[PDB]
Amino acid sequence: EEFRPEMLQGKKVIVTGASKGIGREMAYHLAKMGAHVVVTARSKETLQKVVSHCLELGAASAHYIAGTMEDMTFAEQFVAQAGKLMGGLDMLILNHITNTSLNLFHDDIHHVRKSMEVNFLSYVVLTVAALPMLKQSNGSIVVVSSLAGKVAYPMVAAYSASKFALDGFFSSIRKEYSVSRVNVSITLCVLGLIDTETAMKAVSGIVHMQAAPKEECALEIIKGGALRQEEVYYDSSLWTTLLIRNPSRKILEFLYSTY
Amino acid sequence: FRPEMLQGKKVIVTGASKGIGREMAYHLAKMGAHVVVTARSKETLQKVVSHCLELGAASAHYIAGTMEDMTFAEQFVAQAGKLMGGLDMLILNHITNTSLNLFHDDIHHVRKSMEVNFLSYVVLTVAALPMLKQSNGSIVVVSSLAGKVAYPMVAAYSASKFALDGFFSSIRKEYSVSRVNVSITLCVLGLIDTETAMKAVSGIVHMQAAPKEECALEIIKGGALRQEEVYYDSSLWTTLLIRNPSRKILEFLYS
Ligand SMILES: CC(C)[C@H]1SC(Nc2ccccc2F)=NC1=O
Numbered sequence: 001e002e003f004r005p006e007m008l009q010g011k012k013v014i015v016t017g018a019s020k021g022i023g024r025e026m027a028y029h030l031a032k033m034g035a036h037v038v039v040t041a042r043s044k045e046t047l048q049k050v051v052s053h054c055l056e057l058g059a060a061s062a063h064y065i066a067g068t069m070e071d072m073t074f075a076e077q078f079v080a081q082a083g084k085l086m087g088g089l090d091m092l093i094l095n096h097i098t099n100t101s102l103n104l105f106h107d108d109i110h111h112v113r114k115s116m117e118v119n120f121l122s123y124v125v126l127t128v129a130a131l132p133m134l135k136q137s138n139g140s141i142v143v144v145s146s147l148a149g150k151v152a153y154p155m156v157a158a159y160s161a162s163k164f165a166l167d168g169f170f171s172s173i174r175k176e177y178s179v180s181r182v183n184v185s186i187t188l189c190v191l192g193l194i195d196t197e198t199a200m201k202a203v204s205g206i207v208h209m210q211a212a213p214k215e216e217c218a219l220e221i222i223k224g225g226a227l228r229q230e231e232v233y234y235d236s237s238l239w240t241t242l243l244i245r246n247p248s249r250k251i252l253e254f255l256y257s258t259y
Numbered sequence: 260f261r262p263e264m265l266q267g268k269k270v271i272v273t274g275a276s277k278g279i280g281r282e283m284a285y286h287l288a289k290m291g292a293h294v295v296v297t298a299r300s301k302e303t304l305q306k307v308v309s310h311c312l313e314l315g316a317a318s319a320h321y322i323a324g325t326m327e328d329m330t331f332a333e334q335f336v337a338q339a340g341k342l343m344g345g346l347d348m349l350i351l352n353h354i355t356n357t358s359l360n361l362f363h364d365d366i367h368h369v370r371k372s373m374e375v376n377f378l379s380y381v382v383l384t385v386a387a388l389p390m391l392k393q394s395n396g397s398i399v400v401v402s403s404l405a406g407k408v409a410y411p412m413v414a415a416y417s418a419s420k421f422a423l424d425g426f427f428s429s430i431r432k433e434y435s436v437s438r439v440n441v442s443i444t445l446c447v448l449g450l451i452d453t454e455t456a457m458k459a460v461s462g463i464v465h466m467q468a469a470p471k472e473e474c475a476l477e478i479i480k481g482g483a484l485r486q487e488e489v490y491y492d493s494s495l496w497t498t499l500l501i502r503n504p505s506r507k508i509l510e511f512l513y514s
């Protein structure tokens with residue numbers, strides 16, 4: 001299966017956390033591919049700037065809806081409003097995360113709960129709401145995760161917990177859809193440190209390492225969802241990408257596929 | 260391992276009105292440890308404490324309540340500490356009731372699983388850390404194969420167990436760097452012979468259930484030895500494949 005830019009054109013896609021960083025870049029890449037896009041985040045203005053830019057890039061359609069993913073009601077309403085704005089949905093890209101900084105964990109349960117709600121729970125709510133439209137178009141769901149969602153890393157405990165949660169939930173669902181013959185693909189993207197403006201401000205001091213370009217990253221995530229791959233791995237270190245996979249788990253799940 | 264290690268240690272066991280938690284309480288009792296057990300069933304906790312005294316526990320008390328209530332969770336540990344005069348080991352074992360079903364739209368079960376199976380464990384840990392640091396204690400987190408590998412019919416449950424791994428494994432990293440001498444043991448359990456589990460998987464999961472009595476003992480031992488991870492499954496193949504050598508290498512390299 002070879003990826004082609006043509007694959008995306010009459011495709012209707014949603015991109016959360018697209019006002020900046022990787023989400024923003026994906027919006028542009030999709031626009032350059034001339035697809036319908038509905039970007040969301042909290043900041044209304046910065047979102048207007050990305051939409052206009054998308055149209056200039058050739059976006060077949062570019063809209064936005066501002067709101068906070070801390071409120072599950074907005075999460076639901078968004079998928080509906082975004083759906084009618086483009087008359088369908090063929091790909092759901094969950095990319096948003098709550099503001100996260102690097103710190104030792106002490107007693108901030110508030111941040112832990114907020115992380116689980118925004119980084120994990122809303123992805124589930126968003127999925128439930130978009131599944132129907134996705135089943136209709138045999139869509140695809142792309143869940144943006146991190147290396148800290150596959151391995152343990154100090155200073156990002158709450159963040160790591162939410163990303164690990166995504167793997168457990170969405171990987172389990174993937175198996176359910178397989179037997180329930182549900183034609184919706186789920187792509188888990190495991191990313192390493194990326195040169196995002198937010199990432200840089202929070203990384204200088206703890207995560208001492210090379211940061212991959214956000215533009216390439218955003219494209220790799222998109223191509224993975226298009227090829228309907230179960231997982232995408234993108235990091236600046238080839239030695240990390242070499243050890244990040246876990247064949248034992250794949251084998252064990254095969255041996256278990258024979259409930 | 261030496262049973263003398265627990266000879267008179269102060270231990271908290273959650274979800275101990277039945278199943279694995281109950282067996283752990285009894286093992287601790289026969290070892291002469293001080294034990295405080297919790298769950299929602301007052302009537303049942305009364306019975307476990309009674310048996311614990313019978314088995315030879317240095318001391319045994321219970322405090323009933325639901326871990327869906329974070330305030331109760333926080334206050335429970337402080338009162339448990341007052342009951343034994345401190346704390347040496349915190350065993351987080353409880354989980355919200357979970358049956359096997361495909362995931363449709365039961366957002367309630369997903370959130371409740373995250374709240375009870377994961378968030379309450381964090382609240383409990385935050386409240387017990389002061390006392391655990393005083394005695395260079397240990398935290399024992401009970402998980403499952405479904406917390407290391409994906410499995411259908413238990414999406415919400417699996418999500419919460421994976422979360423425990425990410426959170427507690429990250430904290431362990433911080434503690435070694437921060438000089439926090441409190442061990443964290445994650446227990447990866449295969450199917451266990453508990454009453455609720457045996458009835459929940461009836462006619463669905465076809466695997467040999469390991470004995471809860473032996474399971475409870477290994478969790479204790481692993482906690483006493485301050486082992487980062489305990490793997491317990493009746494199958495030799497599952498025990499081997501459940502490990503992640505790539506992750507251990509990658510992490511050692513990072514640290
Ligand atoms: C937390 C933030 C600075 C960045 S860094 C990240 N994930 C990540 C990647 C590499 C190493 C450790 C990590 F945790 N995800 C993010 O959003």
Ligand SMILES: CC(C)[C@H]1SC(Nc2ccccc2F)=NC1=O
Pocket residue numbers: 354357358359403404405410413416448449450451455456459460464
């Ligand atoms: C969910 C419940 C019936 C039991 S079963 C379990 N873990 C587990 C073990 C083996 C296979 C699938 C699983 F999910 N953990 C539990 O507490």
